[PDB]
Amino acid sequence: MRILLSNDDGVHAPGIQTLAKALREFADVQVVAPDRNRSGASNSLTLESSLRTFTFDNGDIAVQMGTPTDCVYLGVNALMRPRPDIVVSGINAGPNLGDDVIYSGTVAAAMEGRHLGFPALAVSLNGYQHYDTAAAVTCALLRGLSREPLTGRILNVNVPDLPLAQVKGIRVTRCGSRHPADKVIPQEDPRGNTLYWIGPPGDKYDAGPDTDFAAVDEGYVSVTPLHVDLTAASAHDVVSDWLDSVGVGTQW
Amino acid sequence: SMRILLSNDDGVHAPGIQTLAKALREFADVQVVAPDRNRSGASNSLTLESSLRTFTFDNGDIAVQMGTPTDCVYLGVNALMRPRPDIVVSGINAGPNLGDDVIYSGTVAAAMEGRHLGFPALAVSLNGYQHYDTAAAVTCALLRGLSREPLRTGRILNVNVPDLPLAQVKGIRVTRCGSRHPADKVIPQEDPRGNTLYWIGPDTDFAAVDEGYVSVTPLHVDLTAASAHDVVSDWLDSVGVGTQ
Ligand SMILES: [Mg+2]
Ligand SMILES: [Mg+2]
């Protein structure tokens, strides 16, 4: 099996390195990842710019200031030969759940993979410690794909930050929007300045049975068959009719 | 009358948001909640479990320190504007948000965060850096249009305004998002040191703007399919638990 492995956290990240080592047990892996951490950066293709690459002794390739999508696009069309069987993104440091999948770099890489024509998977750890757990989950998932090739959608995977033995299973999920347990909690700093803290005062619950949120709350691996489509083709007529009805733009 | 949460991507100081704010305060109740800095080229995720500091300006505008556009809208909608906003408006952005650019756009991200409100959210971008007055006039017309006849929610309108005087705007068209990406390729290049450097429709938003029309694209969040949910679940139960 041939894997194009990228991430959002960059080539030296523990998530991608833990995943790369576990995958090389059964698969041939090409890493093409950003040269540095990209979590805070936009995830679009860098158009009309000459991107420099760096090749390490182990074969990993770093794209200088490349986004996750740059890495997949350059990997597919220039850097990886022979071409990959599947594009993998992760393991991300932190969850990619609900509305955040629209904005996630980890997700964006997998999406670019699918747009280019390859099966694609994105993996995220809901925490900071148990990358081994997330690695084991990804390997088991990729085993299944080798045995039974699969949808023109990506698989968005979220893993609880727990030892592997405590993960209560794997669920096929839909995406939530924002978590009902998250709240705006007012805070003050030592200087008396106003601060706001977004999240749960206690445990995260009431998320909804089949959401990606709930699955992770209940200690389950969340798997979402995902395709970020923002278009609203059915709404075109209703907006047209509304503009004529109220006469918007007809008063200039 | 209307309660408008106004945010953007360019930050609280941007000429686009400042022009728009002034215009909207003529007929509406406006609260600015915007990033403390320009966020173009930054990611748009929600900042969870990390305290966000706010600055309040003399005029009542609120800046969120290291706040993403979604942080601003989330905070505005749920804490900073009371009673709750009827609508989120995001812009006026300096530069277009057309076609392939909309997914990663901070301007559109802010609107998307405000999509569950009483009115659909507006993301407004000027196709340039000059005629902010035009884009503000367009936004005002849209808002009044929603007052007279409310349009349904869970949705946003992505609005791109041509960088022209208002008298030169040819009209307003409902469009779809274009895509120039299925035409891109990779052309290698030679550095002076030697190393290789790699280089990457009539109803489209691009076309409307190019022809001097304001582009209005309805957007909706669609992520999953019920048939995909079934085909993955049966694919999972093919290879289950075990102890092997
Ligand atoms: Mg990251
Ligand atoms: Mg901007």
Q: In the 3-class helix/strand/coil scheme, how is A168-181 assigned residue by residue? A: CEEEECECCCCCCC
Residue of chain B with shortest Cα separation from A148? B235
Nearest to B176 among A103, A148, A231 (CB): A231
* Partner residue facing B103 (CB), from A143, A228, A236: A228
Which token pair is A130?
A: 């148990």
- Closest-CA residue in chain A for B177? A231
Contact B92, B124 (CB under 8 A): yes
| DSSP code string of B117-153 | SSS-EEEEEEESSS-HHHHHHHHHHHHHHHHHSPPPS
Category of B128 on φ-ψ map: left (φ > 0), alpha (ψ -120 to 50) or beta:
left
Find, among B75, B126, B172, B14, the residue nearest to A198 by Cα: B75
Identify the three-state secondary structure at position B99: helix
Distance A8 CA to ligand 1 centre (A): 5
Q: Which amino acid is at A202?
A: G
Under a CB-based contact definition with an 8 Å cutoff, are residues A11 and A34 in contact? yes
Helix (H, G, I), strand (E, B) or coil at B216: strand
Tokens representing A91 are: 């393991």
Shortest CA distance from B47: residue in chain A: A198
- The count of residues in chain B is 244
Q: Which ligand is nearest to the CA of B108?
A: 2
Phi, psi of B198 (to 5 degrees): -100, 135
Radius of gyration of chain A (CA): 20
| Whole-number Å distance between alpha carbons of A190 and B51 | 13
- d(C-alpha A67, C-alpha A131), whole Å: 22
Side chain identity at residue B131, one-letter code: H
Helical axes A14-23 vs A131-147, angle rounded to 10°: 40
A172–B236: do the CB atoms touch at under 8 Å?
yes
Query: CB-CB: which of B52, B185, B220 is closest to A196?
Result: B52
**Is B29 exposed, middle or buried, given 0-12, 13-18 or 19+ CB atoms closer than 10 A?**
middle
Please give the Cα distance from A222 to A181 (Å, whole number).
18
**Cα A88 to averaged position of ligand 1 atoms, centre (Å):** 14
SS (H, E, C) A90-102: EEEECCCCHHHHH
Query: Which residues of A are less than 8 Å from B141 in CB distance?
Result: 248-249, 251-252
Place of tokens 């900073």: B80
Write down the residue that tokens 């750890």 correspond to.
A125
* Nearest ligand to the C-alpha atom of residue B97: 2
**Can you give the length of chain A in residues?**
252
- Virtual torsion, Cα A171, A177, A181, A184, nearest 10 deg: 150
Q: How far is CA B89 from CA B60, B85, B142, in A?
A: 17, 10, 11
Domain boundaries, chain A: 1-252
Torsion region of A127: left, alpha or beta (phi above 0 gives left; psi -120 to 50 gives alpha): left
Backbone angles phi, psi at A132, to 5 degrees: -55, -45
Experiment used for this model: X-ray
Distance CA A41, CA A174 (A): 26
Number of other CB atoms surrounding residue B149 within 10 Å = 10
- The residue in chain A having the minimum alpha-carbon distance to the alpha carbon of residue B73 is A184
Q: Do B102 and A230 touch (CB under 8 A)?
A: yes
Inter-chain touch A197–B79, beta carbons under 8 Å: no
State in Å: Cα A92 to ligand 1 middle.
Answer: 5
User: Quick check: A252 and B167 CB within 8 A?
Assistant: yes
Q: What is the CATH number of domain A1-252?
A: 3.40.1210.10
Other beta carbons less than 10 A from residue B98's beta carbon: 25
Query: What superfamily in CATH does domain B1-244 come from?
Result: Survival protein SurE-like phosphatase/nucleotidase (3.40.1210.10)
Q: Do A232 and B138 touch (CB under 8 A)?
A: no
Q: Which residue has the tokens 């749960």?
A: A200
- Here the contacts of B179-186 (C-beta below 8 Å, separation 24 or greater) are B179/B99, B179/B100, B180/B99, B180/B100, B181/A45, B181/A115, B181/B100, B184/A45, B184/A47, B184/A73, B185/A77, B186/A73, B186/A74, B186/A77, B186/A78
CB-CB contact of B129 with B155 (8 Å):
no
Query: What are the two backbone dihedrals, phi and then psi, of residue A25, each rounded to the nearest 5 degrees?
Result: -75, -25
A48/B236 CB distance under 8 A: no
Q: Resolution reached, in Å?
A: 2.1
